[PDB]
Amino acid sequence: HMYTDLKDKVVVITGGSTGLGRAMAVRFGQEEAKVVINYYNNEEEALDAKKEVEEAGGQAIIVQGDVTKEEDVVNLVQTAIKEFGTLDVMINNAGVENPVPSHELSLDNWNKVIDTNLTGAFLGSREAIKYFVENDIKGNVINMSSVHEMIPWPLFVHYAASKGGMKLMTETLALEYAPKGIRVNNIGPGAMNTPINAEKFADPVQRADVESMIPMGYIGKPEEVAAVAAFLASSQASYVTGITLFADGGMTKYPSFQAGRG
Amino acid sequence: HMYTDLKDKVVVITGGSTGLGRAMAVRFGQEEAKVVINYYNNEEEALDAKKEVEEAGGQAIIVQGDVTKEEDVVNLVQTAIKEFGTLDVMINNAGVENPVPSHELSLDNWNKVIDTNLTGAFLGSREAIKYFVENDIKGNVINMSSVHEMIPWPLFVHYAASKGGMKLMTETLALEYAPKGIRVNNIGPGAMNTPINAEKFADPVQRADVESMIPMGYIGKPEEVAAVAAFLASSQASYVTGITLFADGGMTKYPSFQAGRG
Amino acid sequence: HMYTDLKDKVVVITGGSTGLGRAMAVRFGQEEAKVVINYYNNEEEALDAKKEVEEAGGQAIIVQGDVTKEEDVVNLVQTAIKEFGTLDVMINNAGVENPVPSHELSLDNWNKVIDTNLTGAFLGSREAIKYFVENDIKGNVINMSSVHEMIPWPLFVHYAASKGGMKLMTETLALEYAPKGIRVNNIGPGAMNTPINAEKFADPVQRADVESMIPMGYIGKPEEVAAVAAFLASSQASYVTGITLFADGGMTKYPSFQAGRG
Amino acid sequence: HMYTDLKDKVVVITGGSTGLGRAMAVRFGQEEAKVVINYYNNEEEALDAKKEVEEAGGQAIIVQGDVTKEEDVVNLVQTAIKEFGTLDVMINNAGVENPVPSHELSLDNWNKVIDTNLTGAFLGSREAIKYFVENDIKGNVINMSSVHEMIPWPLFVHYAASKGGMKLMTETLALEYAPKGIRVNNIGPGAMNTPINAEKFADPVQRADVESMIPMGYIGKPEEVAAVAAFLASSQASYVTGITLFADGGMTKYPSFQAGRG
Numbered sequence A, B, C, D: 001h002m003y004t005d006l007k008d009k010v011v012v013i014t015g016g017s018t019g020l021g022r023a024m025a026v027r028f029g030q031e032e033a034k035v036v037i038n039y040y041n042n043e044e045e046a047l048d049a050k051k052e053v054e055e056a057g058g059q060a061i062i063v064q065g066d067v068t069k070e071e072d073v074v075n076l077v078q079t080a081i082k083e084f085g086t087l088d089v090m091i092n093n094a095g096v097e098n099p100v101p102s103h104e105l106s107l108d109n110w111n112k113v114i115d116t117n118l119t120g121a122f123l124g125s126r127e128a129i130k131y132f133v134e135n136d137i138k139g140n141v142i143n144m145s146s147v148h149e150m151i152p153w154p155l156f157v158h159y160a161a162s163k164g165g166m167k168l169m170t171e172t173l174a175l176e177y178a179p180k181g182i183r184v185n186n187i188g189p190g191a192m193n194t195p196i197n198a199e200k201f202a203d204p205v206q207r208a209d210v211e212s213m214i215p216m217g218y219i220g221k222p223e224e225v226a227a228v229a230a231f232l233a234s235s236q237a238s239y240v241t242g243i244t245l246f247a248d249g250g251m252t253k254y255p256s257f258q259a260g261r262g
């Protein structure tokens, strides 16, 4: 396979049962890693995800957990160490979103998105870094951000805030723990072909509208994001820390400015 | 009288009893505005500040409120509209911070900083914009950020995350409500001479270290930031929205590279 | 009279005979400054502008010069010091642009834009700072940039590159000369109502397309930018150096994401 | 090997005889690519570089050329196509630098650095894109930038300007040619162990000073940058365009802020 240093590394992935999380689980499985698949409630998809990792060449366990509960995040990292003996790569991928005019967004709805997308990632990063620090492991954290840590997002002010926060969180942790050889990075996906979007992307006018925001002209395949994760996790990225690697087909480059407009 | 257009405008300021909030309160008093001074803890300080605003030529009330409580933020804007008749400028300035190695940061401590620094500003921004939209007012929001929406801050990952989040919140709201003429900006102070830093700056070793990180060579004066706030609230900045204006003596320009090191 | 501290300050402005440079010339006249109007091509325009500055309450000369010629830039600053006694504010505003598919852009055409937009501002900045350093003056430099130091611009790769370069030049000079109290900032205009755009904005289809890319919904007025320049040159912005202040009606916030598309 | 899609791809590298250029040449040779090594005057190092690529498993030619001469850049890309049949990846790596107080920097010295570091890269990118466009190849451009497209650099205002320009150049070309499947990216190296630095890094106090600017605590090995180039060139980065991938051991994260300072 591609990244031989990933062989037998322990990789924890929150929200790893579907979409980008699942595609990363499979990709690490192709690198013969040991994958720990976290999931919220859908056991059967998690079980499905588990079998793919094994069929791709990896070992895999599944572990239920809500990333807004501190005990569940703590339990997740502990289960990883118990079952597989160590922890090498931590991937905070869980996320939720919903459209609301910002002046109408409730505090409860704001909190759900902040608690899930930002705080969940802090909790995961923290538990992983604690472990690397205590055991002198030169481990790796990948936080799943979005083009919306840079691109503002009307109707999604909670989501945008959560990812803008994630960017400074990641950059801080990278600076703080760089002297220990612990690397911390964001991946910034653009529009991706995942379950959350299956409804929207079946509709031809909506699919075309979205593709018109993508300079490369196509909706990303989850494996293209998983390719970025494998690179970032591997020793090929040994000197790469504190960055956001956008995988967005050019979306952060301002799609409205194609053909020299404005 | 510099910004004549500010005369009789209603300006609400959270944490307006001390430091930067106080300086802003005074300055808008100097512009003959109607300043609403929110405070959490210390009525005696708020009273002392209410006096300065009045002496400087402004009108002022004080309103107790905790920015982490929705009812208190809603109450604050409603009080402003009761007492002064309307709302023109909403300044979300309240903030807290404390150093903790990130892998040792507790969830409650992380939540306290996020709730105060980011969510409080969301609540502030939401209530003001709600009022602007329902009443066809071309209102203005100033969110008080930090060099640390750009500069990562080891030991302060909660703070850094809250301001990185504030950046994207501001940018989103500016984009979302620009067609209504409602403008939303951040100010980014560097190291400022305020109570929050009084401990640090007393120690001449610590004061010198902080100063060695400011290219302009001096710790900022709170009036230098209030000058930026008066500009942004004024019609002078009519085409200016969604920005962060750093008032930092050069701090975001990378202190370590002075004289060309590296 | 807004910024009383600007009275009798010597302000040099390249391309000060038309558009934004003219608006800045007028505005500093309104602050009772001594405006030096550089121009390349059209004395009759420069004369018409010299008049406005004088009517608005300022003192003004005109000086012919090509900003791509070192001798002309050196001459310009030397003329300013001859005629008015000193130099306080140096504004590098001259710029050119033309659309060409990048793979068809000639080296001479690329050079013309770089030489004019970036190198001319370097020469301007260098000569002013040289004068500030030798004479212990806490001078000020405003470099006129664009949304396109951040927004990429197909068909205008030369322009975009010149302003991206201007950004780092400004930031470097701000860092390098901050300990001397010399401040250096950029302004970043979006789509502005100037001669350079008169062709584009005459066509009602083209005017509407440009407007659909401004969140605030209108093409900027040149006085809105001159208001930003007066602020930055003034002592109100005493702690502000090394920044880019965008005056763009929200354009850097990603036009394509209005109403929450994507 | 690692990236099997790189097998037999034609890769042109300017300044490919030494340092980062040489390390990329060798790394592509390890991927069994066909490497075209450009060089300014040192034929013997270029010859040395050539033999390494072959010994690593690649094909390789050397071609003399000065990137400030348009004909030399044109000849380089033509020689690549002539000799190897096509062009797949273009790498603009040539660069020069020297320290000068900015107010003392000559126009000739400014131009040399601009012409080499920025214009050379425009010329290379242009000739490559022309070829990809004319022949419907989904090719790849990698422009060698620096941490100094983001980190300002006193005494190196020409270098900083050149790389700030390179950033907007790359981003523009990525947006412009994304619909054609042509990807364009920057790599941003921090302090790297290359010949230009051998003098500085032999001295223990200077080596320690530099390492103190690096959060990861070590000077980068050229192969760590070449690892980024291989990733970016490969189809693993299929959805990655218009980005700068910093490989700097955390240098852009503000080294002066370690341990919670300021």
Ligand SMILES: NC(=O)C1=CN([C@@H]2O[C@H](COP(=O)(O)OP(=O)(O)OC[C@H]3O[C@@H](n4cnc5c(N)ncnc54)[C@H](O)[C@@H]3O)[C@@H](O)[C@H]2O)C=CC1
Pocket (backbone or CB within 6 Å): B014, B015, B016, B017, B018, B019, B020, B021, B039, B040, B041, B065, B066, B067, B068, B093, B094, B095, B096, B116, B144, B145, B146, B147, B188, B189, B190, B191, B192, B193, B194, B195, B196, B197
């Ligand atoms: N002083 C500095 O060097 C810098 C401060 N700025 C920011 O500017 C703002 C102003 O702070 P300073 O005046 O410097 O310090 P400060 O501590 O004097 O002011 C902060 C204010 O926030 C208030 N506050 C805290 N929690 C609150 C709550 N739950 N509800 C209502 N009010 C609450 C405090 O009562 C206080 O008056 C802060 O957001 C700070 O983060 C950021 C960058 C640097």
Ligand SMILES: NC(=O)C1=CN([C@@H]2O[C@H](COP(=O)(O)OP(=O)(O)OC[C@H]3O[C@@H](n4cnc5c(N)ncnc54)[C@H](O)[C@@H]3O)[C@@H](O)[C@H]2O)C=CC1
Pocket (backbone or CB within 6 Å): C014, C015, C016, C017, C018, C019, C020, C021, C039, C040, C041, C065, C066, C067, C068, C093, C094, C095, C096, C116, C144, C145, C146, C147, C188, C189, C190, C191, C192, C193, C194, C195, C196, C197
């Ligand atoms: N108008 C707009 O929408 C925007 C313009 N700004 C920038 O603001 C600046 C002002 O331009 P505008 O007033 O809008 O257009 P303009 O074309 O009216 O002004 C540009 C000025 O530069 C001068 N100039 C050109 N080459 C010169 C040379 N070699 N030597 C001396 N002067 C020379 C011209 O004579 C002209 O007066 C420009 O740098 C432009 O790039 C940037 C963003 C948007």
